[PDB]
Nucleic acid binder design. Structure first.
Ligand SMILES: [Mg+2]
Ligand code: NA
Ligand SMILES: [Zn+2]
Length: 352
DNA sequence: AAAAA
């Protein structure tokens, strides 16, 4: 039996159902841009369960015993089995509002509100937006437009590793005892990503040294001419608050990655790379690692399972047991899964 | 408002 919860499934990168899931992901995206939360959720959960299958669906009979496949989802599966394409997903891909929203939000610093503003202004291309003389851009949008081509190109593993080396060398300079872990998609086995994520923690740092680290590292990169964009969000972390972005100190950067630093098989001798850095208190390292490893659907199901099946409250900071009225401690992800009564799911099995 | 796993 297949669980309705992603945290109770193993979801590896060998997706045998890409024909179905790419269509369901398009339909979910469209419901997200069109403010239909209920419908977005249904397509996401159905796409997620199909991703977990060890075989391709080739008939409607193969969908038997699979949870989260409503009548609307089963009609989409049926249409794809019929001729290999989804008429519903194809109509979304041809929709003018969907196309503009995907295009505009592909720019770093442009979200739903700005994409909507530009669409209602009659803009349809990035060329027309960038060259417009009346529009005013935020500093994040200016960096988004300045480094567009590099940011829209996938970050690959040799590039993520070259960034990891930079992060580690910068962090060790100020905190020699620091632990630096690459998170997100790359930790789950992905060959590519839109960015590179890191979780930094220090067993000995004081509250102040841990506040100062991201400032020290970004200033060190600014001096070297590597910081292309920087936004540091201060911590709002509360040591004793119940579990519910996360509240940890973090920064969203654009780094200058020199081609010479990249050990791969293969113009300007550098590439712009989006880098996220998260600093957390040492005792909460496992919760932040679990939260930042993802995938987003895996994290959503973990929290839902903890609430509805275990009467536990879980987030990126802590795990609280409402019955025992006690916070549960963990030095690893394995201990969090054990506290939750879940079989351990390896990072590369969390691609829900 | 946007950045996010
Ligand atoms: Mg990522
Ligand atoms: Na964007
Ligand atoms: Zn990121």
């Amino acid at each position: 039996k297949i669980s309705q919860y992603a945290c109770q499934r193993r979801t590896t990168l060998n997706n045998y159902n890409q024909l179905f899931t790419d269509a369901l992901d398009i339909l979910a995206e469209n419901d997200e841009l069109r403010e239909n939360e209920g419908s977005c959720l249904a397509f996401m959960r159905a796409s997620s369960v199909l991703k977990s299958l060890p075989f391709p669906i080739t008939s409607m009979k193969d969908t038997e015993g699979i949870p989260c496949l409503g009548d609307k989802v089963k009609s989409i599966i049926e249409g794809i089995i019929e001729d290999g394409e989804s008429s519903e997903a194809k109509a979304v891909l041809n929709d003018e509002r969907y196309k503009s929203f995907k295009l505009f939000t592909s720019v770093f610093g442009v979200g739903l509100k700005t994409a909507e503003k530009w669409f209602r202004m009659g803009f349809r291309t990035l060329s027309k937006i960038q060259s417009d003389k009346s529009l005013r851009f935020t500093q994040m949008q200016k960096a988004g437009f300045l480094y567009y081509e590099d940011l829209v190109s996938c970050v690959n593993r040799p590039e993520a590793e070259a960034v990891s080396m930079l992060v580690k060398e910068a962090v060790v300079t100020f905190l020699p005892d620091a632990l630096v872990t690459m998170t997100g998609g790359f930790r789950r086995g992905k060959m590519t990503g839109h960015d590179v994520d890191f979780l930094i923690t220090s067993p000995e740092a004081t509250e102040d040294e841990e506040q100062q680290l991201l400032h020290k590292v970004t200033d060190f990169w600014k001096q070297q001419g590597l910081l292309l964009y920087c936004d540091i969000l201060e911590s709002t972390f509360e040591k004793f608050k119940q579990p519910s972005l996360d509240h940890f100190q973090k920064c969203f950067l654009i780094l200058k990655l020199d081609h010479g630093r990249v050990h791969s098989e293969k113009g300007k001798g550098w590439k712009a790379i989006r880098v996220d850095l998260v600093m957390c208190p040492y005792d909460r390292r496992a919760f932040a690692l679990l939260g930042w490893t993802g995938s987003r659907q895996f994290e959503r199901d973990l929290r839902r399972y903890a609430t509805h099946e275990r009467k536990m409250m879980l987030d990126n900071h802590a795990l609280y047991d409402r019955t025992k009225r006690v916070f549960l401690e963990a030095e690893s992800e394995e201990e969090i899964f054990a506290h939750l009564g879940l079989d351990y799911i390896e990072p590369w099995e969390r691609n829900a």
